[PDB]
Amino acid sequence: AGVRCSLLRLQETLSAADRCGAALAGHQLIRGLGQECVLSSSPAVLALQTSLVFSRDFGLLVFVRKSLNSIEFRECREEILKFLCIFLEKMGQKIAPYSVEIKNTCTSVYTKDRAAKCKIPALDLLIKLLQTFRSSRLMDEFKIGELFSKFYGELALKKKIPDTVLEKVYELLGLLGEVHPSEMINNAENLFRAFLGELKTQMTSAVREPKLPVLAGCLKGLSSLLCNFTKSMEEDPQTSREIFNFVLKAIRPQIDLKRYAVPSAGLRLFALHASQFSTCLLDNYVSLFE
């Protein structure tokens, strides 16, 4: 029983913090928490970790959702969410039942400026939920209304947020535009209202530099929305070619860094729904194959 009980005790013991004023007294215990949780790599220990960590009376996520005077808890999120993000798909076969509790767990307050260290994963955890749980009942059911209210308010805020969360807002709005059921067929049209001018604004109109994250977020948001409203009826030469040229414009690397999501949106939509825009091929040549 050594293998199971070792991790069980190493998790049960380190179930309380002592966050106070001292030398790095707000990061080290959480670092140990993460570095001891990572050792879970077998199905048995993975099941035990999913039972313990995703409990409601104890675990990392419970006090993450309960620590709200969280100025020095931003480092705790910085560690735990950035660990669980990789954890949810590195080994995620066991954890079906608690993605709803994970959605309850994510949360947001920060200074408006250049950075705060949890602005990367704050919605990237929900992006991993999008990737992990796809068409399943874990989605299309659980309060997508709260998201399309609050984050639509975030988009109407009109760039009063830094880069890292603005990318995620555009991306997650675009992907939530793909979860069709039960809501917002009428509000889907507003996405173009921005995505028509702002994508031109970001990349080649040098008013603001074509830095990668804003471009990647704007493209990913603009891309995922045409998963529905199929263009076999109308708008193939209107909103499936003059944004498609924008997709080509964005896929090419505006700098040689060429990060993951900057071209990923276009190629992903190409692999998924190239079948929708079809009248364009009547004149469009495929000589760009090389």
């Binding site: 307050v109 920060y110 200074t111 408006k112 805020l157």
Partner: protein, 413 residues
């Protein structure tokens, strides 16, 4: 109006007492001459505006329009403006204080009252108002270090149909502690709204029990008013334990909160439908545990709160009219914790049917053997159960005999 104008330019005085005199004298001025004055808004545009590092650039004159609402004066009789909205947002920008003395804002308690102002009398400005006001109110929480709870707390009880967007995100973010701020957020939750159905999974967490009694008197009443306002739909499995400390708020000091307790209990007994004795339902436990406090609540030292239960038990709710069934019901009303007062309470409940009798105009014999008399005396707490009749004071209505009996019975065992 032009006499008012100079004060409207100069209400400010560094002495606060003379400032109160100024406010009171303008209040009397508008209280006597309300039908001879008007309100030019250009005189008041700058009475709320300004831009300083903390406060009071061109404005300390806030009670100016506070008097308007307090004494029944309609606004916007003179025409509006497209940029009357800055009158809102500039004062909202006054949030950035570092004041040390529990005021938290020169941003007006009164400013948010536009939703109250312009609902009964319809002007369309509020609809464009609210969206942008809320946008900037959610944004500037990260501008500088100060709290925006007051920006809802003092505008509470204003336009309830849209007064709930804040909680929709705040509940994940600022569940409250810290005393006075805790009471402010209690008053914030006091707004009645449908926006929450599944939130009782929050109270499925325990410690809303000792926090109930954190600070004395009126501060904590919203906590019980929570259950009060969500009573209709419940299946109170957890109000079992939640009412257990309420068993001990007889032990915990309060009087207004104890009155709210008694109202809660009075609704409970009637509304689990006590006569609906379903054979299988789990309400049997709460039956007896609710009776456990409903009986003893009469022991409470507030005489008015004793009477509020004395009249309550005397309705057809449990106590019948038939004399021997009446004896049995009160006989059934005994509890081991009321033995000290049971005799007085039993006789009190028994003699009320004597207290209502149409035979009072029939004194015992009424035969006029003597002539007349009357008198009254008072020298200082007193007592009141005397009255004079047609005969000398020898013969009075029967109330004069029964009432002192229970009067003394409440005192001497």
């Amino acid at each position: 109006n032009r006499l008012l104008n100079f004060l409207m330019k100069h209400v400010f005085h560094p002495k606060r007492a003379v400032f109160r005199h100024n406010l009171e004298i303008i209040k009397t001025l508008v209280e006597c001459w309300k039908d001879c004055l008007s309100i030019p808004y250009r005189l008041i545009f700058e009475k709320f505006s300004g831009k300083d590092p903390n406060s009071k650039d061109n404005s300390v004159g806030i009670q100016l329009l506070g008097i308007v609402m307090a004494n029944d004066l309609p606004p916007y009789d003179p025409q509006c403006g497209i940029q009357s909205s800055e009158y809102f947002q500039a004062l909202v920008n006054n949030m950035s204080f570092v004041r040390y003395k529990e005021v938290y804002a020169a941003a007006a308690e009164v400013l948010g009252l536009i939703l109250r102002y312009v609902m009964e009398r319809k002007n369309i400005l509020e609809e464009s108002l609210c969206e942008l006001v809320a946008k900037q109110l959610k944004q500037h929480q990260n501008t500088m270090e100060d709290k925006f709870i007051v920006c809802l707390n003092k505008v509470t009880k204003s336009f309830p149909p849209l007064a709930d967007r804040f909680m929709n995100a705040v509940f994940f973010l600022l569940p409250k502690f810290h005393g006075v701020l805790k009471t402010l957020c209690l008053e914030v939750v006091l707004c009645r709204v449908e926006g929450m159905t599944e939130l009782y999974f929050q109270l499925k967490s325990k410690d809303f029990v000792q926090v109930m009694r954190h600070r004395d008197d009126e501060r904590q009443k919203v906590c019980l008013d929570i259950i009060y306002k969500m009573m209709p739909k419940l299946k109170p499995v957890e109000l079992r334990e939640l009412l257990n400390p309420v068993v001990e708020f007889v032990s915990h000091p309060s009087t207004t909160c104890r009155e709210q307790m008694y109202n809660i209990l009075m609704w409970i007994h009637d509304n689990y439908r006590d006569p609906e004795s379903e054979t299988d339902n789990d309400s049997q436990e709460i039956f007896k545990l609710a009776k456990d406090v409903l009986i003893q609540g009469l022991i409470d030292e507030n005489p008015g709160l004793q009477l509020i239960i004395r009249n309550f038990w005397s309705h057809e709710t449990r106590l019948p009219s038939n004399t021997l069934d009446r004896l049995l019901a009160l006989n059934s009303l005994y509890s081991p914790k009321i033995e000290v007062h049971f005799l007085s309470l039993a006789t009190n409940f028994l003699l009320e049917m004597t207290s209502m009798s149409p035979d009072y105009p029939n004194p015992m014999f009424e035969h006029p053997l003597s002539e007349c008399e009357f008198q009254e005396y008072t020298i200082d707490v007193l007592y009141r159960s005397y009255r004079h009749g047609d005969l000398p004071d020898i013969q009075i209505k029967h109330s004069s005999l029964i009432t002192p009996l229970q009067a003394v019975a409440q005192r001497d065992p």
